């Protein structure tokens with residue numbers, strides 16, 4: 449299993465993202481020898497993390513020498529819901545036909561919960577990013593935008609955990 453890592457993003461108005469989650473990139477690509485391969489790359493506890501705050505956009509970037517993954521969270525003030533709305537990936541794969549590439553999708557809606565509550569799920573979710581890339585959220589507790597007393601709000605647990 450991927451390792452559960454903790455994340456805290458703080459900016460001008462304090463903490464805007466709390467997360468405890470295990471993540472894995474599942475990528476299908478063409479190797480130099482013209483063959484297709486599918487590999488998993490776990491987000492490592494060792495990765496460098498950072499992020500940014502705002503009232504429309506909250507980001508978390510996890511990176512190392514060969515890879516940078518950015519999660520973008522959005523929210524709808526009229527509904528007071530937050531959600532993962534985007535994924536950006538930069539990667540270098542030495543054995544790929546195209547070694548250095550990017551994959552993105554900014555039309556996502558996952559990990560959705562009420563603003564002021566936290567999203568929690570222990571059931572693996574394979575989030576489609578492109579035909580060739582999924583973000584596997586192996587387990588997660590996450591909260592974006594509004595954070596009170598620097599801790600998770602009440603849990604909204606995915607139905608599948610039942």
Ligand SMILES: *[C@@H]1O[C@H](CO)[C@@H](O)[C@H](O)[C@H]1NC(C)=O
Nearest residue numbers: 459460461464500501502503
């Ligand atoms: C902080 O709050 C102010 C006032 O609510 C808002 O205008 C500003 O965009 C917020 N900044 C961040 C980084 O969330």
Ligand SMILES: *[C@@H]1O[C@H](CO)[C@@H](O)[C@H](O)[C@H]1NC(C)=O
Nearest residue numbers: 509516517518536537538550
């Ligand atoms: C990917 O690389 C481009 C160009 O260097 C950069 O603008 C972008 O922020 C990078 N994306 C991530 C998620 O680091």
Ligand SMILES: *[C@@H]1O[C@H](CO)[C@@H](O)[C@H](O)[C@H]1NC(C)=O
Nearest residue numbers: 523524525526527528529557
């Ligand atoms: C934002 O919330 C309002 C109120 O529920 C709704 O009318 C609107 O369609 C929502 N936007 C999106 C993108 O869901």
Ligand SMILES: *[C@@H]1O[C@H](CO)[C@@H](O)[C@H](O)[C@H]1NC(C)=O
Nearest residue numbers: 553555556557576577578579
């Ligand atoms: C991005 O993800 C959304 C949600 O699954 C999907 O509807 C859309 O087709 C995706 N875009 C691409 C280019 O894969």
